Swiss-Prot record, chain B:
Self-assembles to form an icosahedral capsid with a T=16 symmetry, about 200 nm in diameter, and consisting of 150 hexons and 12 pentons (total of 162 capsomers). Hexons form the edges and faces of the capsid and are each composed of six MCP molecules. In contrast, one penton is found at each of the 12 vertices. Eleven of the pentons are MCP pentamers, while the last vertex is occupied by the portal complex. The lineage of its organism: Viruses, Duplodnaviria, Heunggongvirae, Peploviricota, Herviviricetes. Belongs to the herpesviridae major capsid protein family. The chain holds residues 99 to 140 of 1370 of the full protein. The gene is MCP. It comes from the Viruses. Homomultimer. Makes the hexons and eleven out of twelve pentons. Interacts with triplex proteins 1/TRX1 and 2/TRX2; adjacent capsomers are linked together in groups of three by triplexes, heterotrimeric complexes composed of one molecule of TRX1 and two molecules of TRX2. Interacts with scaffold protein; this interaction allows efficient MCP transport to the host nucleus. Interacts with capsid vertex component 2/CVC2. Interacts with the small capsomere-interacting protein/SCP. It is found in: Virion; Host nucleus. This is Major capsid protein.
Curated annotation (Swiss-Prot), chain C:
It comes from Human cytomegalovirus (strain AD169) (HHV-5). Belongs to the herpesviridae major capsid protein family. It is found in: Virion; Host nucleus. Homomultimer. Makes the hexons and eleven out of twelve pentons. Interacts with triplex proteins 1/TRX1 and 2/TRX2; adjacent capsomers are linked together in groups of three by triplexes, heterotrimeric complexes composed of one molecule of TRX1 and two molecules of TRX2. Interacts with scaffold protein; this interaction allows efficient MCP transport to the host nucleus. Interacts with capsid vertex component 2/CVC2. Interacts with the small capsomere-interacting protein/SCP. This is Major capsid protein. The lineage of its organism: Viruses, Duplodnaviria, Heunggongvirae, Peploviricota, Herviviricetes. Disulfide bonds: none annotated.
Curated annotation (Swiss-Prot), chain D:
It comes from the Viruses. This is Triplex capsid protein 1. Signal peptide: none annotated. Interacts with TRX2, MCP and capsid vertex component 2/CVC2. It comes from Human cytomegalovirus (strain AD169).
Swiss-Prot record, chain F:
This is Triplex capsid protein 2. Structural component of the T=16 icosahedral capsid. The capsid is composed of pentamers and hexamers of major capsid protein/MCP, which are linked together by heterotrimers called triplexes. These triplexes are formed by a single molecule of triplex protein 1/TRX1 and two copies of triplex protein 2/TRX2. Additionally, TRX1 is required for efficient transport of TRX2 to the nucleus, which is the site of capsid assembly. HAMAP family: HSV_TRX2. GO terms for molecular function: structural molecule activity. The lineage of its organism: Viruses, Duplodnaviria, Heunggongvirae, Peploviricota, Herviviricetes. Keywords: Capsid protein, Host nucleus, Virion. The keyword Ubl conjugation does not apply.
Amino acid sequence: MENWSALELLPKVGIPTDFLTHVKTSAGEEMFEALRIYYGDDPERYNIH
Amino acid sequence: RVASGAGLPTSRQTTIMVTKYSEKSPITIPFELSAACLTYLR
Amino acid sequence: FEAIFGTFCNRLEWVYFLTSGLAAAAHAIKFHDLNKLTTGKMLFHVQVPRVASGAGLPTSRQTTIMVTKYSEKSPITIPFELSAACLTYLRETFEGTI
Amino acid sequence: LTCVMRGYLYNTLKTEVFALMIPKDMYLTWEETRGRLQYVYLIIVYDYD
Amino acid sequence: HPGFALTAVRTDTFEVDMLLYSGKSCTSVIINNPIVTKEERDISTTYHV
Amino acid sequence: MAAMEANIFCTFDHKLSIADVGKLTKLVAAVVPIPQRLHLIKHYQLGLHQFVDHTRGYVRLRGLLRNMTLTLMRRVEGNQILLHVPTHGLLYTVLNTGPVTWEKGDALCVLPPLFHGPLARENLLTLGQWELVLPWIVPMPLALEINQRLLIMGLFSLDRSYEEVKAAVQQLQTITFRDATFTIPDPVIDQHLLIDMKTACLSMSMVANLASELTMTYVRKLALEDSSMLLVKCQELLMRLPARPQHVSPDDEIARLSALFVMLRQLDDLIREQVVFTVCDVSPDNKSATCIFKG
Amino acid sequence: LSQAGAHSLTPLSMDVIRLGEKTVIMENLRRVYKNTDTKDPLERNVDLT
């Protein structure tokens, strides 16, 4: 439901974030809402409409 | 990702997107005045 | 309004082999023709001190020792991949729009 | 309709890959573990009783 | 009680940390420069190093 | 996430000598099988030696090799070998591993190796109780004869006594092909071959039942007034015991013969291998040829 | 091999202790693996029977 294409395309600020646990577990165990976990390179970010 | 020897598999291009949401908690407090004090204020 | 406050990226903590203290245990050399060689060997030659002894006990003798050591093998690999659309946009710009 | 007979299945700009959908009742597997490459076949069987 | 005094054996696995000591230049590592290899397909290209 | 690799590197971890890498260089452009595809693999998974087991059943090895993937060898260098998977329809060069002679214009198949002569050539990278046993690339008639003789021997094993089976096996173990001869190693009867026997006998009885009156009576009718060496041999093979045809019906006959055609196809597929290669002109020394990869 | 390198030298910071006048370096390899797929190989399993 979140506009992930915006997060990919728009510029962003660099930070040295430090997850408490190993980050893949946090994504796996739904600590956050509204995730997206695409592997590889997903070209869907390009279809601007 | 980190390299590994022969035979063993290897991790790929991996990306994670996560979101954080704000939490609300409005506060309030009333104070009541009497008619005589209000008229003196006027 | 929902008011997106900010889009946060990640900056990786860069690590290089010579930056780590583990390199102190190592001795790092580049060798551009490395894939061609089969095995690398080293040779050792050692002679021992001997102690003179008094009569009554059999005397010590000369000795000579040769030792050979061999090299290991441990290649590593990593893939990275791209979708054709990124290549197309890298190469081709069309209609010039923003 | 436009259709591919020897193909990788994609949109015109290749902005996104197009999947193929099979109805659930028809889908069949004959192994519990899957190698990273596997083929898919069309199967027709007849009941003569 | 039957006429037995059977003895049992069982093994446990522990999750433990290690500390490792080495001297200066115990083993010397010789490396070549990374080598790039390419594979092409219509949907996506891939690289190996 | 996953990507199907096409260029495969194999790395040794045994401290090879100069003779080992020398013999590797001789193997350039040969064909080797792999069970799984990755960018970098260990030598233990390469070659057919990993599968051999004390039973040594040849049918087991053939069935196992059928499932495997085939690759070609290119750019041999120190303890690192590059294997290139073939793409269907392209033109490739190959150096034959076995001693079987090739000819232009025919097809080739993949088979596990055979016992030939003194069994001299096993010098292929014997190291640390592991060895590089390569599969054989042979022309179609030899492979078809091998499969035919294994299946026929298996069928003969039934309804026969032990010593009759031994004599028949010792006869069928040999093969002759293009001035060469070869011997089949460990052709022991096994349950793997029993599955083939069951399906083949079912198909054979089906072709027996589906055959029409005219098809059966054709050979016996033709023997009445024709004569040739082919005919006399065919008649000698058959048992020994004009008139208007009993029934004529081209529609029912064509349906029957189409069903019999399908059944004959099913019976034939038992011995037909996967047609891996179609060949082009070959170097006159018979060592290397140019071929197209199919299947 | 002693001639093969170490011709140029740069400074960097690390921790050290003085024990038996064999001064040694300590480094914690948590940072190099952190979020990667492979586990840190110094975090090991030990077995007893």
